[PDB]
């Protein structure tokens, strides 16, 4: 399980380097690839490696991982800087608000989106 | 940190996952134990008793 | 103490826990982690000798290499935990007019009346 | 609740001191509320009026 | 009313922040340009000069 899928289960390195026995899902198979390519690297080699495999990583997050890339509208890869305030707010509701249960999954996520809308008002208004 | 933070809860709440896809999710499971995980939606009584009743079954045979 | 326990702990959960403690408890944890740092640096000094001895001469060399690679991951957590100790510390050292413009005394009413 | 009163009711006669030393009742208090927090009538009389008897502390308490 | 109908009566006021604009010229629709210039000017000028 330290090398490759064995009965559909692998090992996987945590944020602290503790091994975790997870089911080798497409997300987990992507996780393991990032452990062997990116997270094992020292501190000086980390940032340049991200800027080279930029388009690769984002593509894989939107296809495979449970936490996608934020800056994606209509399935086009963008950056947070290359979004509109509109597009962000739409994207926030798309991930944090549930259509099936008609509720915010957690109340803290509502607050987060709420504070962001306040921020938009704060930015654009002229008088008090 | 962003990639690894808070990666457990999605297994039980697929409705919050991008298109309700299990294949995105970290589901934690032991390799050895997996060869005995077969029966979907087995009541916890029938699972745990069947092992305890199994113990008595053999312990009666060998010693009593 | 539960902070600085010779194994790597997550930082965001430490960064909250450090807030609700006494100043003497932070000094005890700070003492404990620095002792843990000196334990790995004297360990990496010993691993450094067994590298330089065998590098002078490839089985039983990669096993030294990922042993000192692993200690840098644990040591990276220690000085990150010490960095949180510094930031909590520095948060606790903050907590004649002859023109009739003012009074129009050409008028009888403006004086005080 | 432990804090919120369901029914505040405050009543009693209103006597005025006459020159002839005895008082007469020519006034009624008739407060009646629903979901309230405090007694308005009493807090009015604390600040604006006074008790019959005023306690006055010594400059220095004396161990007897 | 305690602090339930005299502390829940207060609204939420918003302070403005600096949205510095680059003041690029407002570009009108095409029909609101053709009124201004005489119509004969279309394809008359060398735009390289």
Interface test with A, best of E16, E18, E20 (most A CBs within 10 A): E16
Residue A73, strand partner residues:
A76
CB contact under 8 A, E15 and A122: yes
Contacting residues for A72 by C-beta, under 8 A, at least 6 apart: A58, A62, A78, A91
CB contact under 8 A, A125 and E16: yes
Name the one residue in this structure whose structure tokens are 């008359």. E44
- Whole-number Å distance between alpha carbons of E3 and D38: 11
Residue A6, strand partner residues:
A9
Q: State the helix-helix crossing angle for A26-34 and A54-63, rounded to 10 degrees.
A: 150
- Whole-number Å distance between alpha carbons of B2 and A80: 15
CA–CA min distance E2, chain D (Å): 5
Q: How far is residue A3 from each of residues A6, A9, B34, C68, measured CA to CA in Å?
A: 9, 11, 18, 21
CA–CA min distance C112, chain A (Å): 39
How big is chain A, counted in residues? 128
- Whole-number Å distance between alpha carbons of E43 and C27: 81
C21 in A contact zone (CB under 8 Å): no
Residues of chain A with C-beta less than 8 angstroms from the C-beta of E19: 123-124
- Whole-number Å distance between alpha carbons of D35 and C67: 70
Q: State the helix-helix crossing angle for C23-55 and C62-91, rounded to 10 degrees.
A: 160
Asked if residue D39 lies in contact with residue D8, where contact means CB atoms within 8 angstroms, the answer is yes
Interface test with E, best of D1, D8, D34, D37 (most E CBs within 10 A): D37
Asked if residue C8 lies in contact with residue A16, where contact means CB atoms within 8 angstroms, the answer is yes
Which residue from B22, B30, B35 is facing A25, i.e. has the nearest CB? B22
Residues of B with CB under 8 A from a CB of A: 1-5, 7, 10, 13, 15-18, 22-31, 34-35
HEC assignment per residue over C31-62: HHHHHHHHHHHHHHHHHHHHHHHHHCCCCCCH
C-beta neighbour count of C84 within 10 angstroms? 20
Instruction: Provide the sign of the torsion angle of the four alpha carbons D43, D49, D53, D57, taken in this order.
Output: positive
- Whole-number Å distance between alpha carbons of A60 and A26: 10
A84 in E contact zone (CB under 8 Å): no
C-beta neighbour count of C76 within 10 angstroms? 14
Nearest to A61 by CA among A85, A43, A93, A38: A38
A67 in B contact zone (CB under 8 Å): yes
Name the one residue in this structure whose structure tokens are 């999954």. A105
Check contact C-D (3+ Cβ pairs < 8 Å): no
CB contact under 8 A, A15 and C9: no
- Whole-number Å distance between alpha carbons of D18 and B51: 94
Residue D30, strand partner residues:
D11
The tokens for A16 are 């602290």
Contacting residues for C15 by C-beta, under 8 A, at least 6 apart: C84
Cα A121 versus chain centre, distance: 27
Q: What are phi and psi of B34, to 5 degrees?
A: -65, -25
- Whole-number Å distance between alpha carbons of D59 and E3: 38
Nearest to A54 by CA among A83, A88, A78: A78
Check contact E-C (3+ Cβ pairs < 8 Å): no
CB contact under 8 A, C9 and A16: yes
Instruction: Provide the sign of the torsion angle of the four alpha carbons D15, D16, D17, D19, taken in this order.
Output: negative
CA–CA min distance D43, chain E (Å): 13
Contacting residues for A25 by C-beta, under 8 A, at least 6 apart: B22, B23, B24, B25, B26, B27
The tokens for E27 are 């570009």
Name the one residue in this structure whose structure tokens are 């996780």. A31
The tokens for A85 are 């305030």
To one decimal, the resolution in angstroms is 4.6
Query: Radius of gyration of chain E from Cα atoms?
Result: 27
CA angle centred on B32, ends B28 and B36, rounded to 5°? 90
The tokens for A3 are 């090398």
Asked if residue C74 lies in contact with residue C12, where contact means CB atoms within 8 angstroms, the answer is no
What is the end-to-end Cα distance of chain B in Å, rounded?
57
Beta strands in chain C (DSSP E): none
Element (H, E) at C66: helix C62-91
For chain D, the helix, strand and coil percentages under 3-state DSSP, each to the nearest 5? 15, 30, 55
> A80: which DSSP letter?
G
């Amino acid at each position: 399980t330290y090398k490759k899928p064995t009965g559909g289960i692998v090992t996987v390195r945590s944020e602290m380097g503790e091994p975790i026995h997870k089911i080798a899902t497409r997300g987990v198979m992507l996780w393991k690839e990032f452990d062997e390519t990116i997270f094992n690297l020292p501190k000086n080699k980390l940032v340049p490696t991200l800027e080279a495999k930029r388009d690769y990583i984002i593509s894989r997050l939107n296809a495979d991982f449970q936490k996608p890339w934020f800056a994606t509208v209509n399935g086009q890869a963008r950056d947070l800087a290359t979004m509109t305030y509109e597009e962000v707010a739409k994207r926030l509701v798309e991930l944090m608000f549930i259509r099936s249960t008609n509720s915010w999954f957690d109340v803290t996520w509502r607050t987060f989106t709420g504070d962001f809308l306040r921020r938009v008002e704060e930015r654009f208004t002229k008088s008090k | 940190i962003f990639f690894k933070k808070d990666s457990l809860w999605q297994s039980e709440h697929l409705e919050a996952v991008v298109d309700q896809d299990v294949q995105r999710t970290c589901i934690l499971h032991g390799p050895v134990a997996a060869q005995f995980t077969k029966v979907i939606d087995e009541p916890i009584k029938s699972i745990m008793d069947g092992i305890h009743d199994g113990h008595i079954k053999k312990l009666l045979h060998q010693y009593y | 103490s539960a902070g600085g326990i010779r194994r790597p702990i997550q930082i965001e959960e430490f960064k909250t826990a450090i807030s609700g403690m006494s100043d003497m408890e932070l000094a005890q944890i700070k003492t404990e982690i620095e002792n843990s740092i000196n334990h790995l640096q004297r360990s990496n000094a010993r691993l450094g000798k067994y590298i330089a001895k065998l590098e002078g001469a490839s089985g039983d060399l990669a096993l030294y290499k990922d042993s000192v690679r692993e200690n840098e991951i644990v040591l990276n957590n220690y000085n990150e935990r010490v960095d949180a100790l510094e930031q909590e510390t520095v948060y606790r050292k903050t907590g004649v007019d002859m023109d009739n413009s003012n009074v129009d005394v050409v008028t009888p009413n403006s004086i005080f009346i | 609740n432990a804090n919120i009163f369901s029914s505040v009711k405050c009543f009693g006669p209103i006597k005025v001191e006459l020159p002839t030393k005895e008082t007469v009742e020519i006034g009624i208090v008739d407060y009646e509320a629903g979901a309230s927090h405090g007694n308005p009538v009493v807090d009015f009389l604390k600040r604006n009026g006074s008790t019959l008897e005023q306690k006055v502390n010594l400059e220095n308490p004396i161990p007897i | 009313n305690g602090n339930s109908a005299d502390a829940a009566y207060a609204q939420v006021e918003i302070q403005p922040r600096a949205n510095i604009q680059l003041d690029f010229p407002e570009l009108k629709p095409y029909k609101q340009v053709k009124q201004i210039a005489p119509a004969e000017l279309e394809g008359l000028l060398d735009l390289e000069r």
